[PDB]
């Protein structure tokens, strides 16, 4: 709880992160308590990290990607559509800017908001093609909690990538608007709109 | 407490060191500025255009400081980039070799680099002193 | 993907037949005394033989 002097001097804001590990230096991984269970053990909080870059292996087993942190899994769903393949330095830079904007409006915890997004745009009832042809029937299945996390990260980040495309608004703030709208539940986010499309199909495909 | 030019960030050093030689003004900026692009792989000339030769010389003299010898050909390969060949894919093209040779001959006459019998330019007695002063300035400004 | 060939399992079973009051439930000494009581042409071959043989004792107890 003290400042330390070294021959190569360390700044004080990083020296204050000695007492708690936060996102990048700013937002704690504590009080990110998830109001909806069944996604706990699949939203990966309760292990703090500093930056959302980790070269960790999580795709060599069936469920190791449930232990990749939920901010790294959000950065992961950004760096695609070819021209952005590779480039996690750009995707981590976005989420640093994104969690700023999530903190500025609706001034609460920006990690809690992206967690509130994943628990809100996870598709709880989906459908599958029963019958092995084009002229078939569709059946209402329940959805795995890993898939509800898997699709929610996909639905939010696609709706960020679409809305930031071809306009002045940045990927930093479209995603921030995507996650804030999804945190409330508003039908003005892409991911909530796409989720209720999946769920109204399964009401009728029972 | 004795500051070298490694304790200061390279972006913040070169901006400070370029504005020093600009406000001092003895660098003999060669005359063909605003007609040159700094590389064949470039589309445009430098976008600041009253400047950029103070910045190129600040980056060269820093690069001489870090290294032990740098010549012109190593300097062109340094500042080259991806050349858009239009419809064929990109490539590395070395930078302009008359700009960087007239950077080095400029820093010689103001005493920063010299002839260095293992190649091209090593940084001088005085040039090491000159960059080290600015490095002392930059941490506490 | 870890099923063992007959040449591992015959040589393991032929070791148990005539060297039970010898080599024990430890792989490491089983690895090392197959150097003396068997002529095995490869280090990778010896360790698979010594490991199934170790697996066999743990079943025998």
């Amino acid at each position: 709880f003290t400042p330390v002097v070294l021959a190569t001097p360390i700044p004080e804001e990083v020296q204050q992160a000695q007492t708690e590990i936060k996102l990048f230096n700013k937002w704690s991984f504590e009080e990110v308590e998830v109001k909806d269970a069944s996604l706990v053990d699949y939203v990966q909080v309760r292990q703090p990290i500093f930056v959302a870059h980790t070269a960790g292996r999580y795709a060599n087993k069936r469920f190791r990607k449930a232990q990749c942190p939920i901010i790294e899994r959000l950065t992961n769903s950004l760096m695609m559509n070819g021209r952005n393949n590779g480039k996690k330095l750009k995707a981590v830079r976005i989420i640093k800017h994104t969690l700023d904007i999530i903190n500025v409006l609706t001034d609460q915890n920006p990690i809690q908001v992206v967690v509130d997004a994943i628990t809100n745009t996870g598709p709880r009832e989906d459908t599958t093609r029963v019958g092995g042809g084009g002229a078939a029937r569709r059946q209402a299945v329940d959805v795995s909690p890993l898939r509800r996390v898997n699709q929610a990260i996909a639905l939010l980040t696609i709706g960020a990538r679409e809305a930031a495309f071809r306009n002045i608004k940045t990927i930093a703030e479209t995603l921030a608007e995507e996650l804030i709208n999804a945190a409330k539940g508003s039908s003005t986010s892409y991911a909530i709109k796409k989720k209720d499309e999946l769920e109204r199909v399964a009401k009728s495909n029972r | 407490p004795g500051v070298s030019v490694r304790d200061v960030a390279a972006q913040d050093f070169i901006n400070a060191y370029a504005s020093f030689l600009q406000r001092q003004g003895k660098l003999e900026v060669p005359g063909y500025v605003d007609i040159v692009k700094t590389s064949s792989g470039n589309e445009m000339p430098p976008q600041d255009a009253e400047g950029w030769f103070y910045k190129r010389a600040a980056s060269v003299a820093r690069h001489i400081y870090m290294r032990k010898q740098v010549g012109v050909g190593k300097l062109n390969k340094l500042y080259g980039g991806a050349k858009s060949r239009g419809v064929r894919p990109y490539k590395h093209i070395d930078a302009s070799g008359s700009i960087n040779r007239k950077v080095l001959q400029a820093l010689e006459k103001i005493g920063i680099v010299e002839i260095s019998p293992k190649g091209g330019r090593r940084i001088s007695e005085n040039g090491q002193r000159d960059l080290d002063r600015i490095a002392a300035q930059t941490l506490e400004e | 993907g870890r099923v063992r060939t007959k040449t591992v399992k015959r040589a393991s079973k032929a070791l148990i037949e005539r060297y039970y009051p010898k080599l024990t439930l430890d792989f490491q000494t089983n690895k090392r005394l197959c150097d003396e009581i068997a002529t095995i042409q490869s280090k990778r071959l010896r360790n698979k033989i010594a490991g199934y043989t170790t697996h066999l004792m743990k079943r025998i107890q």
């Binding site: 299945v141 329940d142 909690p145 | - | -």
Partner: protein, 63 residues
């Protein structure tokens, strides 16, 4: 909509035409040991907690 969280007891096997549907046996968290069998689209595992928008329907596709 009165949803119910249910707790996986057994992964009874894959079903569906392509194998992408896994049939599981769950017990409800509220009023526990009220055990039924459901279909799951994503990767389901033992002791996963998953949510049902209906309380009276058992999975019918198998083998």
């Amino acid at each position: 909509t009165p949803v119910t969280l249910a707790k996986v007891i057994k992964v009874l096997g894959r079903t569906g035409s392509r194998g992408g549907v896994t049939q599981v046996r769950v017990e409800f968290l509220e009023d526990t040991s009220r055990t039924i069998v459901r279909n799951v689209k994503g990767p389901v595992r033992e002791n996963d907690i998953l949510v049902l928008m209906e309380s009276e329907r058992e999975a019918r596709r198998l083998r």
